[PDB]
Amino acid sequence: KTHVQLSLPVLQVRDVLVRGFGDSVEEVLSEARQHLKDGTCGLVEVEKGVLPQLEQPYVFIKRSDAAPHGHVMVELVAELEGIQYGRSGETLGVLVPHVGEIPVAYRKVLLRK
């Protein structure tokens, strides 16, 4: 399937134990996709002061369309030193590894895979 229905645990930035996916744009996109597939991916909602608390490169989920079965269609865009790799809509959040942090909510997405 080109798209997969996922329910992403929404984590508070200060709870996050593993604050990025790796050290290159290609690695973080690779790792983010693997974690999304394995159900070990969380989402942090981007507000003032969040991103400086996470590790670059960042992986964003961005709205790719204006929402089947409640699931917003999203795709991955990475960012490193102010350059983005990919082009998409509004940020729903920044992806991070999930290693058992308690979420505050779930974000239903349809991920272009």
Side-chain angles (χ1 to χ4, degrees), residues 20-33 55-59 77-81 83 85:
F21 283 114
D23 300 331
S24 74
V25 163
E26 291 154 272
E27 181 177 23
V28 301
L29 285 169
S30 185
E31 282 296 333
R33 287 195 167 92
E55 297 173 339
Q56 299 195 44
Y58 309 128
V59 176
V77 176
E79 180 187 307
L80 177 57
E81 295 156 348
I83 303 168
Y85 300 79

PDB file of all heavy atoms in Angstrom, residues 20-33 55-59 77-81 83 85:
ATOM      1  N   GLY A  20      16.186  12.459  18.590  1.00  0.00           N
ATOM      2  CA  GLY A  20      16.296  12.470  17.124  1.00  0.00           C
ATOM      3  C   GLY A  20      16.539  11.090  16.607  1.00  0.00           C
ATOM      4  O   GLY A  20      16.696  10.152  17.426  1.00  0.00           O
ATOM      5  N   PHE A  21      16.605  10.960  15.290  1.00  0.00           N
ATOM      6  CA  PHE A  21      16.713   9.661  14.617  1.00  0.00           C
ATOM      7  C   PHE A  21      18.150   9.410  14.151  1.00  0.00           C
ATOM      8  O   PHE A  21      18.431   8.321  13.773  1.00  0.00           O
ATOM      9  CB  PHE A  21      15.709   9.608  13.473  1.00  0.00           C
ATOM     10  CG  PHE A  21      14.290   9.360  13.909  1.00  0.00           C
ATOM     11  CD1 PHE A  21      13.326  10.327  13.741  1.00  0.00           C
ATOM     12  CD2 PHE A  21      13.919   8.143  14.457  1.00  0.00           C
ATOM     13  CE1 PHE A  21      12.004  10.068  14.094  1.00  0.00           C
ATOM     14  CE2 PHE A  21      12.601   7.897  14.815  1.00  0.00           C
ATOM     15  CZ  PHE A  21      11.656   8.862  14.637  1.00  0.00           C
ATOM     16  N   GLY A  22      19.038  10.388  14.203  1.00  0.00           N
ATOM     17  CA  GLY A  22      20.395  10.179  13.671  1.00  0.00           C
ATOM     18  C   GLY A  22      21.023  11.464  13.195  1.00  0.00           C
ATOM     19  O   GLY A  22      20.624  12.564  13.641  1.00  0.00           O
ATOM     20  N   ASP A  23      22.012  11.322  12.328  1.00  0.00           N
ATOM     21  CA  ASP A  23      23.070  12.344  12.165  1.00  0.00           C
ATOM     22  C   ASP A  23      23.120  12.901  10.745  1.00  0.00           C
ATOM     23  O   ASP A  23      23.942  13.785  10.544  1.00  0.00           O
ATOM     24  CB  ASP A  23      24.409  11.728  12.547  1.00  0.00           C
ATOM     25  CG  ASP A  23      24.411  11.257  13.994  1.00  0.00           C
ATOM     26  OD1 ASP A  23      23.679  11.867  14.818  1.00  0.00           O
ATOM     27  OD2 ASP A  23      25.141  10.295  14.278  1.00  0.00           O
ATOM     28  N   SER A  24      22.323  12.390   9.805  1.00  0.00           N
ATOM     29  CA  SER A  24      22.248  12.903   8.414  1.00  0.00           C
ATOM     30  C   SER A  24      20.784  12.990   8.009  1.00  0.00           C
ATOM     31  O   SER A  24      19.969  12.296   8.627  1.00  0.00           O
ATOM     32  CB  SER A  24      23.022  12.046   7.458  1.00  0.00           C
ATOM     33  OG  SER A  24      22.367  10.816   7.180  1.00  0.00           O
ATOM     34  N   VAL A  25      20.467  13.821   7.019  1.00  0.00           N
ATOM     35  CA  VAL A  25      19.073  13.940   6.499  1.00  0.00           C
ATOM     36  C   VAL A  25      18.623  12.550   6.052  1.00  0.00           C
ATOM     37  O   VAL A  25      17.459  12.133   6.338  1.00  0.00           O
ATOM     38  CB  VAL A  25      18.998  14.971   5.357  1.00  0.00           C
ATOM     39  CG1 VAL A  25      17.724  14.823   4.543  1.00  0.00           C
ATOM     40  CG2 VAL A  25      19.147  16.391   5.876  1.00  0.00           C
ATOM     41  N   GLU A  26      19.490  11.829   5.339  1.00  0.00           N
ATOM     42  CA  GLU A  26      19.074  10.535   4.755  1.00  0.00           C
ATOM     43  C   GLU A  26      18.846   9.525   5.897  1.00  0.00           C
ATOM     44  O   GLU A  26      17.926   8.678   5.769  1.00  0.00           O
ATOM     45  CB  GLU A  26      20.125  10.004   3.783  1.00  0.00           C
ATOM     46  CG  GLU A  26      20.253  10.812   2.507  1.00  0.00           C
ATOM     47  CD  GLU A  26      21.651  10.651   1.948  1.00  0.00           C
ATOM     48  OE1 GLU A  26      22.520  11.429   2.341  1.00  0.00           O
ATOM     49  OE2 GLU A  26      21.882   9.688   1.222  1.00  0.00           O
ATOM     50  N   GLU A  27      19.680   9.562   6.947  1.00  0.00           N
ATOM     51  CA  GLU A  27      19.545   8.591   8.067  1.00  0.00           C
ATOM     52  C   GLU A  27      18.251   8.859   8.846  1.00  0.00           C
ATOM     53  O   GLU A  27      17.586   7.879   9.223  1.00  0.00           O
ATOM     54  CB  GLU A  27      20.738   8.612   9.011  1.00  0.00           C
ATOM     55  CG  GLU A  27      20.590   7.604  10.142  1.00  0.00           C
ATOM     56  CD  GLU A  27      21.778   7.530  11.081  1.00  0.00           C
ATOM     57  OE1 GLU A  27      22.539   8.528  11.147  1.00  0.00           O
ATOM     58  OE2 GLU A  27      21.944   6.467  11.753  1.00  0.00           O
ATOM     59  N   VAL A  28      17.915  10.113   9.098  1.00  0.00           N
ATOM     60  CA  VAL A  28      16.766  10.441   9.983  1.00  0.00           C
ATOM     61  C   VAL A  28      15.479  10.091   9.236  1.00  0.00           C
ATOM     62  O   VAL A  28      14.558   9.583   9.892  1.00  0.00           O
ATOM     63  CB  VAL A  28      16.767  11.888  10.493  1.00  0.00           C
ATOM     64  CG1 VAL A  28      18.044  12.185  11.274  1.00  0.00           C
ATOM     65  CG2 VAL A  28      16.543  12.920   9.393  1.00  0.00           C
ATOM     66  N   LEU A  29      15.414  10.364   7.929  1.00  0.00           N
ATOM     67  CA  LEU A  29      14.254   9.955   7.096  1.00  0.00           C
ATOM     68  C   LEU A  29      14.146   8.431   7.066  1.00  0.00           C
ATOM     69  O   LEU A  29      13.016   7.917   7.167  1.00  0.00           O
ATOM     70  CB  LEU A  29      14.389  10.532   5.688  1.00  0.00           C
ATOM     71  CG  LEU A  29      14.096  12.023   5.558  1.00  0.00           C
ATOM     72  CD1 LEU A  29      14.523  12.535   4.185  1.00  0.00           C
ATOM     73  CD2 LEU A  29      12.620  12.309   5.804  1.00  0.00           C
ATOM     74  N   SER A  30      15.274   7.726   6.914  1.00  0.00           N
ATOM     75  CA  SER A  30      15.335   6.234   6.921  1.00  0.00           C
ATOM     76  C   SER A  30      14.790   5.699   8.240  1.00  0.00           C
ATOM     77  O   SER A  30      13.876   4.818   8.226  1.00  0.00           O
ATOM     78  CB  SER A  30      16.725   5.699   6.718  1.00  0.00           C
ATOM     79  OG  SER A  30      16.671   4.288   6.613  1.00  0.00           O
ATOM     80  N   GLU A  31      15.366   6.199   9.334  1.00  0.00           N
ATOM     81  CA  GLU A  31      15.055   5.728  10.710  1.00  0.00           C
ATOM     82  C   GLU A  31      13.590   6.072  11.014  1.00  0.00           C
ATOM     83  O   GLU A  31      12.898   5.203  11.576  1.00  0.00           O
ATOM     84  CB  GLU A  31      16.056   6.328  11.695  1.00  0.00           C
ATOM     85  CG  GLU A  31      17.396   5.629  11.679  1.00  0.00           C
ATOM     86  CD  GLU A  31      17.308   4.183  12.128  1.00  0.00           C
ATOM     87  OE1 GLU A  31      16.398   3.866  12.903  1.00  0.00           O
ATOM     88  OE2 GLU A  31      18.143   3.393  11.713  1.00  0.00           O
ATOM     89  N   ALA A  32      13.130   7.260  10.626  1.00  0.00           N
ATOM     90  CA  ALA A  32      11.746   7.702  10.920  1.00  0.00           C
ATOM     91  C   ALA A  32      10.774   6.712  10.262  1.00  0.00           C
ATOM     92  O   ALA A  32       9.833   6.210  10.936  1.00  0.00           O
ATOM     93  CB  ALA A  32      11.532   9.127  10.489  1.00  0.00           C
ATOM     94  N   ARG A  33      11.040   6.371   9.007  1.00  0.00           N
ATOM     95  CA  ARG A  33      10.193   5.439   8.224  1.00  0.00           C
ATOM     96  C   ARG A  33      10.219   4.062   8.879  1.00  0.00           C
ATOM     97  O   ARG A  33       9.126   3.478   9.093  1.00  0.00           O
ATOM     98  CB  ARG A  33      10.682   5.386   6.775  1.00  0.00           C
ATOM     99  CG  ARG A  33      10.358   6.640   5.989  1.00  0.00           C
ATOM    100  CD  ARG A  33      10.532   6.409   4.500  1.00  0.00           C
ATOM    101  NE  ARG A  33       9.941   7.510   3.752  1.00  0.00           N
ATOM    102  CZ  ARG A  33      10.588   8.604   3.354  1.00  0.00           C
ATOM    103  NH1 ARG A  33      11.878   8.757   3.593  1.00  0.00           N
ATOM    104  NH2 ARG A  33       9.934   9.546   2.698  1.00  0.00           N
ATOM    105  N   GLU A  55      17.146  17.198  18.629  1.00  0.00           N
ATOM    106  CA  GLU A  55      18.402  17.064  17.857  1.00  0.00           C
ATOM    107  C   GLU A  55      18.099  17.162  16.359  1.00  0.00           C
ATOM    108  O   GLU A  55      17.230  16.439  15.850  1.00  0.00           O
ATOM    109  CB  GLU A  55      19.083  15.742  18.198  1.00  0.00           C
ATOM    110  CG  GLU A  55      19.502  15.678  19.649  1.00  0.00           C
ATOM    111  CD  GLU A  55      20.032  14.334  20.088  1.00  0.00           C
ATOM    112  OE1 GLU A  55      19.720  13.344  19.404  1.00  0.00           O
ATOM    113  OE2 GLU A  55      20.752  14.284  21.118  1.00  0.00           O
ATOM    114  N   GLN A  56      18.854  17.994  15.664  1.00  0.00           N
ATOM    115  CA  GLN A  56      18.885  18.007  14.178  1.00  0.00           C
ATOM    116  C   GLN A  56      19.729  16.854  13.652  1.00  0.00           C
ATOM    117  O   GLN A  56      20.633  16.393  14.328  1.00  0.00           O
ATOM    118  CB  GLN A  56      19.532  19.294  13.703  1.00  0.00           C
ATOM    119  CG  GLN A  56      18.783  20.534  14.144  1.00  0.00           C
ATOM    120  CD  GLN A  56      19.239  21.727  13.348  1.00  0.00           C
ATOM    121  OE1 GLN A  56      19.392  21.649  12.134  1.00  0.00           O
ATOM    122  NE2 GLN A  56      19.471  22.837  14.037  1.00  0.00           N
ATOM    123  N   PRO A  57      19.505  16.360  12.415  1.00  0.00           N
ATOM    124  CA  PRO A  57      18.394  16.800  11.572  1.00  0.00           C
ATOM    125  C   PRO A  57      17.022  16.436  12.165  1.00  0.00           C
ATOM    126  O   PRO A  57      16.943  15.385  12.795  1.00  0.00           O
ATOM    127  CB  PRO A  57      18.597  16.024  10.260  1.00  0.00           C
ATOM    128  CG  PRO A  57      20.045  15.558  10.306  1.00  0.00           C
ATOM    129  CD  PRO A  57      20.318  15.319  11.771  1.00  0.00           C
ATOM    130  N   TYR A  58      16.021  17.296  11.976  1.00  0.00           N
ATOM    131  CA  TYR A  58      14.607  17.059  12.371  1.00  0.00           C
ATOM    132  C   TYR A  58      13.873  16.294  11.268  1.00  0.00           C
ATOM    133  O   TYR A  58      14.211  16.473  10.051  1.00  0.00           O
ATOM    134  CB  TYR A  58      13.825  18.349  12.587  1.00  0.00           C
ATOM    135  CG  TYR A  58      14.470  19.343  13.509  1.00  0.00           C
ATOM    136  CD1 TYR A  58      14.640  20.665  13.115  1.00  0.00           C
ATOM    137  CD2 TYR A  58      14.878  18.982  14.785  1.00  0.00           C
ATOM    138  CE1 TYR A  58      15.221  21.594  13.967  1.00  0.00           C
ATOM    139  CE2 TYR A  58      15.463  19.898  15.642  1.00  0.00           C
ATOM    140  CZ  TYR A  58      15.634  21.207  15.231  1.00  0.00           C
ATOM    141  OH  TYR A  58      16.206  22.110  16.070  1.00  0.00           O
ATOM    142  N   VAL A  59      12.890  15.474  11.661  1.00  0.00           N
ATOM    143  CA  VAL A  59      11.931  14.881  10.691  1.00  0.00           C
ATOM    144  C   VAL A  59      10.564  15.436  11.053  1.00  0.00           C
ATOM    145  O   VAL A  59      10.141  15.208  12.215  1.00  0.00           O
ATOM    146  CB  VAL A  59      11.911  13.348  10.702  1.00  0.00           C
ATOM    147  CG1 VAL A  59      10.838  12.849   9.744  1.00  0.00           C
ATOM    148  CG2 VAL A  59      13.257  12.740  10.366  1.00  0.00           C
ATOM    149  N   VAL A  77       9.248  15.398   5.764  1.00  0.00           N
ATOM    150  CA  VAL A  77      10.243  16.423   5.343  1.00  0.00           C
ATOM    151  C   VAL A  77      11.313  16.524   6.437  1.00  0.00           C
ATOM    152  O   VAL A  77      10.945  16.719   7.624  1.00  0.00           O
ATOM    153  CB  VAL A  77       9.541  17.773   5.148  1.00  0.00           C
ATOM    154  CG1 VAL A  77      10.533  18.882   4.815  1.00  0.00           C
ATOM    155  CG2 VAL A  77       8.423  17.658   4.107  1.00  0.00           C
ATOM    156  N   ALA A  78      12.581  16.404   6.079  1.00  0.00           N
ATOM    157  CA  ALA A  78      13.696  16.561   7.038  1.00  0.00           C
ATOM    158  C   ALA A  78      14.206  17.994   6.964  1.00  0.00           C
ATOM    159  O   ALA A  78      14.008  18.681   5.908  1.00  0.00           O
ATOM    160  CB  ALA A  78      14.789  15.556   6.797  1.00  0.00           C
ATOM    161  N   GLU A  79      14.845  18.442   8.047  1.00  0.00           N
ATOM    162  CA  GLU A  79      15.441  19.795   8.117  1.00  0.00           C
ATOM    163  C   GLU A  79      16.799  19.719   8.818  1.00  0.00           C
ATOM    164  O   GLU A  79      16.917  19.016   9.868  1.00  0.00           O
ATOM    165  CB  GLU A  79      14.494  20.774   8.806  1.00  0.00           C
ATOM    166  CG  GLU A  79      15.049  22.177   8.902  1.00  0.00           C
ATOM    167  CD  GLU A  79      14.195  23.109   9.741  1.00  0.00           C
ATOM    168  OE1 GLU A  79      12.976  23.201   9.459  1.00  0.00           O
ATOM    169  OE2 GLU A  79      14.746  23.714  10.688  1.00  0.00           O
ATOM    170  N   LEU A  80      17.793  20.414   8.260  1.00  0.00           N
ATOM    171  CA  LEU A  80      19.168  20.486   8.822  1.00  0.00           C
ATOM    172  C   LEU A  80      19.715  21.878   8.493  1.00  0.00           C
ATOM    173  O   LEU A  80      19.727  22.226   7.281  1.00  0.00           O
ATOM    174  CB  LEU A  80      20.076  19.398   8.238  1.00  0.00           C
ATOM    175  CG  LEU A  80      21.534  19.463   8.720  1.00  0.00           C
ATOM    176  CD1 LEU A  80      21.611  19.383  10.242  1.00  0.00           C
ATOM    177  CD2 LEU A  80      22.395  18.380   8.090  1.00  0.00           C
ATOM    178  N   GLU A  81      20.076  22.632   9.540  1.00  0.00           N
ATOM    179  CA  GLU A  81      20.635  24.012   9.474  1.00  0.00           C
ATOM    180  C   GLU A  81      19.783  24.859   8.522  1.00  0.00           C
ATOM    181  O   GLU A  81      20.374  25.555   7.645  1.00  0.00           O
ATOM    182  CB  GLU A  81      22.110  23.970   9.085  1.00  0.00           C
ATOM    183  CG  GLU A  81      22.957  23.294  10.146  1.00  0.00           C
ATOM    184  CD  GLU A  81      24.258  22.697   9.646  1.00  0.00           C
ATOM    185  OE1 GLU A  81      24.430  22.596   8.411  1.00  0.00           O
ATOM    186  OE2 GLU A  81      25.099  22.342  10.497  1.00  0.00           O
ATOM    187  N   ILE A  83      17.686  24.196   6.123  1.00  0.00           N
ATOM    188  CA  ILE A  83      17.320  23.684   4.771  1.00  0.00           C
ATOM    189  C   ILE A  83      16.438  22.443   4.925  1.00  0.00           C
ATOM    190  O   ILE A  83      16.828  21.538   5.660  1.00  0.00           O
ATOM    191  CB  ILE A  83      18.567  23.402   3.927  1.00  0.00           C
ATOM    192  CG1 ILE A  83      19.442  24.652   3.784  1.00  0.00           C
ATOM    193  CG2 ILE A  83      18.174  22.842   2.569  1.00  0.00           C
ATOM    194  CD1 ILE A  83      20.814  24.356   3.203  1.00  0.00           C
ATOM    195  N   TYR A  85      14.324  19.158   3.116  1.00  0.00           N
ATOM    196  CA  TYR A  85      14.490  18.152   2.037  1.00  0.00           C
ATOM    197  C   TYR A  85      13.119  17.525   1.863  1.00  0.00           C
ATOM    198  O   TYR A  85      12.666  16.738   2.730  1.00  0.00           O
ATOM    199  CB  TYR A  85      15.611  17.189   2.382  1.00  0.00           C
ATOM    200  CG  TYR A  85      16.920  17.907   2.550  1.00  0.00           C
ATOM    201  CD1 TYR A  85      17.209  18.594   3.714  1.00  0.00           C
ATOM    202  CD2 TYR A  85      17.819  18.004   1.502  1.00  0.00           C
ATOM    203  CE1 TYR A  85      18.400  19.286   3.873  1.00  0.00           C
ATOM    204  CE2 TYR A  85      19.021  18.682   1.649  1.00  0.00           C
ATOM    205  CZ  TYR A  85      19.311  19.333   2.835  1.00  0.00           C
ATOM    206  OH  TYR A  85      20.478  20.027   2.994  1.00  0.00           O
TER     207      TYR A  85
END
